[PDB]
Amino acid sequence: AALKAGEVIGSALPASPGAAAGKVYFTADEAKAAHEKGERVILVRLETSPEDIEGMHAAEGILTVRGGMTSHAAVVARGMGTCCVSGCGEIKINEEAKTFELGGHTFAEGDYISLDGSTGKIYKGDIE
Numbered sequence: 001a002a003l004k005a006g007e008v009i010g011s012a013l014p015a016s017p018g019a020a021a022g023k024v025y026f027t028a029d030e031a032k033a034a035h036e037k038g039e040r041v042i043l044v045r046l047e048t049s050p051e052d053i054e055g056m057h058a059a060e061g062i063l064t065v066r067g068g069m070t071s072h073a074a075v076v077a078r079g080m081g082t083c084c085v086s087g088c089g090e091i092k093i094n095e096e097a098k099t100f101e102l103g104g105h106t107f108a109e110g111d112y113i114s115l116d117g118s119t120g121k122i123y124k125g126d127i128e
Helices: 028-037 053-058 072-080
Strands: 013-016 018-023 061-063 083-086 100-102 105-107 112-117 122-124
Touching: 013 072, 013 083, 013 112, 018 061, 018 083, 028 053, 053 072, 061 112, 072 083, 083 112
Parallel strands: 061 083
Antiparallel strands: 018 112, 100 105, 112 122
16 A cells, blocks of 8 residues: 555655654654654754654654764664664755755645655655
């Protein structure tokens, strides 16, 4: 089902083999609330850091504009087996909130998306 014609937006580099479905968010604080309300959260950042770990767990998924073949982002992910992406096309961030424009769609920090980690293919809407 799907994954054969999903309206996928783009595909960055496969940081760590992972699969997740969470709502976009650019803060470890929002994860604390989410993690306590429903979890399933994602994290977008122009740079990854260790201490953010707590934010990493709650964020079983991470789509950043930076990162690379290997770095704190991946290294930490490979250790936490968490799904994470790094270095995408030209994700333009929109302050309207905290979005990122990629492929042919604008993902705003205010929706639900499903990103893959095993080849590096992002998708939106919880598959089923």
